[PDB]
Amino acid sequence: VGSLNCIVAVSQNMGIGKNGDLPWPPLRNEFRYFQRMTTTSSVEGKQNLVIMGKKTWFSIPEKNRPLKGRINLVLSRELKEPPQGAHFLSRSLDDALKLTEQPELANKVDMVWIVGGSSVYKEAMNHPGHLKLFVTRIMQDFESDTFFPEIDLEKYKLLPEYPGVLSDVQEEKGIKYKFEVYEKND
Ligand SMILES: NC(=O)C1=CN([C@@H]2O[C@H](COP(=O)(O)OP(=O)(O)OC[C@H]3O[C@@H](n4cnc5c(N)ncnc54)[C@H](OP(=O)(O)O)[C@@H]3O)[C@@H](O)[C@H]2O)C=CC1
Numbered sequence: 148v149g150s151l152n153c154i155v156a157v158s159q160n161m162g163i164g165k166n167g168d169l170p171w172p173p174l175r176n177e178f179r180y181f182q183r184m185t186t187t188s189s190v191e192g193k194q195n196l197v198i199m200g201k202k203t204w205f206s207i208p209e210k211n212r213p214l215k216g217r218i219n220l221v222l223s224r225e226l227k228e229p230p231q232g233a234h235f236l237s238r239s240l241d242d243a244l245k246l247t248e249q250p251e252l253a254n255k256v257d258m259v260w261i262v263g264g265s266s267v268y269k270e271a272m273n274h275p276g277h278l279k280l281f282v283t284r285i286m287q288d289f290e291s292d293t294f295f296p297e298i299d300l301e302k303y304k305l306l307p308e309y310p311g312v313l314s315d316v317q318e319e320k321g322i323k324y325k326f327e328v329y330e331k332n333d
């Protein structure tokens with residue numbers, strides 16, 4: 148199994164969600180970035196795997212769910228089986244990672260991408276090991292009820308550029324944003 152990564156789009160006030168939806172209007176190219184980055188495997192014959200909390204799974208509309216071309220794993224301790232359209236269910240992040248290291252999966256999965264939500268991000272971010280965070284900075288304040296956890300810059304280094312990630316400012320629907328990549332190893 149390959150690298151463990153988080154990916155998120157966050158507003159200036161650290162908002163990632165409002166009532167199971169994005170705090171900001173749909174940004175199509177931002178969605179395209181998300182899709183490209185999470186689905187693109189660097190190894191031929193392998194897929195990436197996406198890990199998300201239950202509420203994140205259900206915040207994806209049925210039309211966009213499961214995230215195609217990726218293995219979809221949902222975290223929940225209430226659920227007894229994976230949601231309709233999902234592939235796997237784990238009761239903890241460690242369990243989900245262990246699952247990827249099984250003989251079944253270890254030969255199939257390249258990159259593991261945590262796609263939300265807050266508690267999943269926090270858990271992964273505060274867990275020793277090699278980890279990258281792919282962060283879209285939405286450069287406006289948007290009313291939110293779910294927030295990205297603090298990035299500890301003592302351990303997460305902002306990378307000066309990264310392949311396949313544009314380094315300049317983007318704009319959609321009058322909203323400016325930029326792509327960042329952070330990396331720790333502890
Ligand atoms: N801007 C962005 O990039 C993103 C935004 N979003 C937004 O964020 C919100 C959804 O995120 P959030 O509310 O934080 O919820 P989550 O997606 O993190 O879901 C929370 C649920 O998942 C389960 N869970 C979380 N962590 C674990 C764990 N470690 N082990 C087992 N189960 C776990 C629990 O389910 P149970 O109670 O069943 O145990 C918990 O109730 C929505 O508003 C969505 O639109 C989501 C992703 C990205």
Ligand SMILES: CCc1nc(N)nc(N)c1OCCCOc1cccc(-c2c(N)nc(N)nc2CC)c1
Nearest residue numbers: 154155156168169177178181206207208211262283
């Ligand atoms: C995104 C799924 C979706 N697609 C369409 N077409 N409409 C929706 N309403 C919708 O759900 C919106 C609420 C669910 O939020 C998520 C769910 C998973 C991933 C991300 C996500 C992320 N983790 N990192 C970045 N950078 N960017 C995004 C947004 C593209 C956001």
